[PDB]
Every structure is written in structure tokens, then in C-alpha cells.
Amino acid sequence: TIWYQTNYVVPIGAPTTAYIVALAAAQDNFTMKLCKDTEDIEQTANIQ
């Protein structure tokens, strides 16, 4: 969860609405195992 701590303070002449980009990754201790199929590819028809 991300929370507003103080406020968004802006001078006069600058936009009052900003956008925040979020990035995500792993670390050196990240480990996976037990390969399997995913849900992200589907065939409802042949590939022409």
C-alpha cells in the first residue's frame, strides 16, 4: 500500500497533477523451480 504522508505541494505555474511509474524486479536470492505450462497462450484455431 502507498499512502499520502504530507501532501502534494506545487508552485504557481506548474501542473497540479503528476504521474508515478512503478517498476518491479527480483533480487539475487530469487529462485524458482518446477516448470509448468502457463495460461498466457491459447489455441482456439489452427495457425495459418
Binding site: 504522508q5 505541494v9 506545487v10
Partner: protein
Amino acid sequence: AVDKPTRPDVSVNRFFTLDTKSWAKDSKGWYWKFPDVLTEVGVFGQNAQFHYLYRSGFCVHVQCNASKFHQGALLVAVLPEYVLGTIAGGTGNENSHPPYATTQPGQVGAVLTHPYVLDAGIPLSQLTVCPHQWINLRTNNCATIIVPYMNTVPFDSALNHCNFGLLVIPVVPLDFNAGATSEIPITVTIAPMCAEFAGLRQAVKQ
């Protein structure tokens, strides 16, 4: 004390963020009473109710954000043994004491009435004799003060005795022209340091 004290390092000592105080031009400032703020919050507050003896150090941190078009100054000071006075109706012939709501504001805090005397009858210009830090919105928007345990006794009851107060006083009123953002928050986060509890007992609220 002949008892062997507990040292819950991780569940006790951590940064505790409090509510934000909206600044206004006529704002007189606020004050908190330690360690009465954290008595209702987290593991620190629960073990304080089950233990009669209390000793810890504190970490004071204040947050006030502003832009380059904002000009203001805040005075964050630590006054040990801060006692609240009373105007006595203004005449001076009446004997009255402040209630438990003002002397024990709790987590939300309380607001000053006459910041010149700090309701102690003492000048505000002499407040810098005690440890203090200035927050100037053109340079430093934050403040950090490390206050150790100061008392005539090694251990003391956390519920009744308040060690020191915290004063955030807008000495120089913040000025901004029309069109600028008028909402300026003041965030105060605090943390205990080196806490020792003793005299495990029943549940005692106040």
C-alpha cells in the same frame, strides 16, 4: 530494580507516524506529551499497560513541506518537564488546574492558547536554551532531535509521568500569494530507543 527487564527490540523501537496538522496563518502551534502519545499504539502501548516501570529514549522527527514560493519558519524544541498553567479566569483570584484532556492530550495532541508564555508563564524567546531545531522552508523542510531518558529515577511509571513535551511553533507566519496551494501539512513521526520494561502486572489503562 531486582527484576530482569524485557527488551523487545523489533516490536518496540520503530518509527511511529502520527496525524498531520494543517497549517494556517493564525495557527498558534501544537504540543504533545511523551510518552503519552504511543500508549494506545502498537506493541509499545500494550506492554506499557502491563508493566509498571518504564525507561526509554526517544527520536523526534518533524516534517513540513513547502515550495520555493513559500516563506516560513518553524521552531521545534524539546522542553523537559513541561507543566501546563492556567489563566485563572484572567483575574488571578481563582484556583484552577488544567484537566486531564489538556495535560494528557493523547495521540492527537493539543493546541497552544498563548504561545508567548507557552502556558508556562515563561518567554518564548528563551525556548532555545533547551535542545531545539529550526525548520526554514527555504532550506530544511525536516528536523531530527535525539532526546535520551532524563529523570531523577532510573525507572518510572509511563502512564502518570510525562517526561518532556514537543513544541512546533510557527514563529514566522508562512506567507503565500493567491493561487498557491494553501494546504501545508505538518507531519510528526517519533520512535523509541532502548526501551526497558519491568513489573509485569495486569491491564491498567489510566
